[PDB]
Structures are given as structure tokens and as C-alpha cells.
Amino acid sequence: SEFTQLSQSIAEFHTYQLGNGRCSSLLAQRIHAPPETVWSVVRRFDRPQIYKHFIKSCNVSEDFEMRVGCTRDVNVISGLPANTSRERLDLLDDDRRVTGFSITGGEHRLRNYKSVTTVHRFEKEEERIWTVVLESYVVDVPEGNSEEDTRLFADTVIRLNLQKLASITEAMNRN
Amino acid sequence: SEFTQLSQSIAEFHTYQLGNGRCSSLLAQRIHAPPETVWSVVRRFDRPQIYKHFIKSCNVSEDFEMRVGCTRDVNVISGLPANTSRERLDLLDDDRRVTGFSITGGEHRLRNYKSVTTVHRFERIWTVVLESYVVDVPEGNSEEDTRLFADTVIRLNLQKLASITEAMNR
């Protein structure tokens, strides 16, 4: 009744098929803000700078329109030299609060990365409406790297981004 | 006096010797906690993992000395292959709350990196932590990018430092 809405998502969107040279992970974050607000940032494929770290800039096309197959160039500085990540919107559903993308090139740390993020309502007593965000990915493990190492990297940045997301979003709920 | 102490600290440790092939920066973090507490975290050369991000592990010698000249191996979390960063403790003055280190090798993104951190009293009781660094920029690489990488990691580390330290006040 409570974690049922969540375990359904995990099953459909955050559950993965142990490929040979591939790895994945799932991460969660509580935000003290309403899902509608959180969703309104997460869904903006156009501007991931708002809740993500290490983004120098993000460019889309002049005639930009958000739809599955959508494209963005993300100029990242989480390493050196700078790096332009070519990413594509894989899915977007404003009703179920589900969005997802992949990295088609330009990012040698995360080859064939595919991610999905889902926002959840959690009202658990003066039950103010809180949120839980889930973010998972699947990605290639570079040959000559351990699963663990590529996983530590992806998880660390996702964790920091989800923390920024919590702040930016918790700020919008006391403004 | 507290602002004189800070300004003199800048002049002595956070001021650098320009220009081409080289770049530097200074960042600051106000932390609502006593500087005594912050300094006891910052001074721990053998465990930067307490407040710094992207460290998989940090190994010291089996008979670890804690004096200028100490070394530490930092296994860094990049998306790249096993990147061990060798760091030397340049400076450690408990009375002035000043530490500093250099990257002697193994970290290709930050060659000849030298950083200094100072902790300052401001009066609850509040602290300011300043951190600056000087690093190489090989020609062809853009100064802006390398600064941006450096500045972002320091910022995140200092935010966590605030958190960890502000938590140590029960």
C-alpha cells in the first residue's frame, strides 16, 4: 500500500539484466518537498545544470523540443581535459513521473550509459508531503577496469547530484 | 584583529606567484562550529576521506609519522584506471591552524599541485576555512577548465567539511 508504488517502479525501471561487461546500481534520496516540485526540475532534459554538478554548459538545438530521441550536448568538467557528453532522452512520462536518458558518445568514463529517474510521493501525524527520488543506471565497464571502480565513480556523482537536487528543491519549498 | 589575522594569513599562504603555464584560486567556507573542532578534522593528513570527495582509500606508512615530510597514497575515484595520488605534507602548524600539501606524482590532472588550508576564528562561535592552491596548466589545456575542475572539488569538500564539523556539535 505504501512501498507498493515504489517496488513496482524498481521492478519496471530500476531492475537490471546482468550483461557480461556491464554494471549497474540504484540510488535513492529523500527530499523534503512536494513531488510536483521535484518532478518539475528532474523532467527538464533541457537544463540538467540546475541539479547536477560539474556541468560547464549544456546546449540543445535552436528548434529544441522535448521528445523521445531528443538530444543534448553536456560539457562536463568532472575531469580533465573537458569533455562533451552526447546524451539522448529515452523516455518521459509526466503522469508516472518517469524520465530516462542514455549517453551515446563523448564520455569515455561511462560508455553506453543508460539511466532512469523516478519521483515518488511519501506521506508518512501532520503528514506533510515528502518525496523519494530513485536513480538507476546500467553502463559498460571499460575493459581493464573492475566493476567496483566504474560503480564507485557513477554512484559518487549520482549521490552528489541527488543531494544538490534535494537542496535546490527544498529551497523552492521555502521561498 | 580576527580580520587582521585572516588577511595576514592570506598574504602569507593564499597569495601566489603568477602567470603563464600556471594558475591558482582561493575558496572560502563559513562553518558554524568552533575552529578547534574544524581544525582537528582538517589537520588529519592521514585521513582526508573524512570530508573530501572522490577518495576510494588513503594508505600511509605502517609506522606513520605525523610531521612535515609525511607521505600518503590516495586512491582517487575518477572514471579512469587505478589512479594513485602521492601527496606530501608541506606545512602543519597547530598554533596557527595551517596545513598544506603537494601532489608529488600520480595525478595527471593536477601536476605540481600545491594547496594550503587555514582555519580562522570568528565571534555561538563561527569559523571560516580558506583553501587555496597553485597548479600547472600545460599549454593547449585551457586555464578556465582546470580552474573549474579544481574549484568545484574544493567547494564540495568544504561543504562536506561544514556538514561533518557542524554535526560534531551534538
Swiss-Prot record, chain B:
Changing residue 77 to K: Forms monomer and exhibits an enhanced ABA affinity. It is found in: Cytoplasm; Nucleus; Cell membrane. GO terms for biological process: abscisic acid-activated signaling pathway; defense response. A motif (Latch loop) lies at residues 108-110. It comes from the Eukaryota. The record marks 81, 142 as: Involved in interactions with PP2Cs. Receptor for abscisic acid (ABA) required for ABA-mediated responses such as stomatal closure and germination inhibition. Inhibits the activity of group-A protein phosphatases type 2C (PP2Cs) when activated by ABA. Can be activated by both (-)-ABA and (+)-ABA. Homodimer. Binds ABA on one subunit only. Interacts with HAB1, ABI1 and ABI2, and possibly with other PP2Cs. Binds to CARs protein in an ABA-independent manner, both at the plasma membrane and in the nucleus. Interacts directly with CAR1 and CAR4. Belongs to the PYR/PYL/RCAR abscisic acid intracellular receptor family. This is Abscisic acid receptor PYL1. It comes from Arabidopsis thaliana. The chain holds residues 36 to 210 of 221 of the full protein.
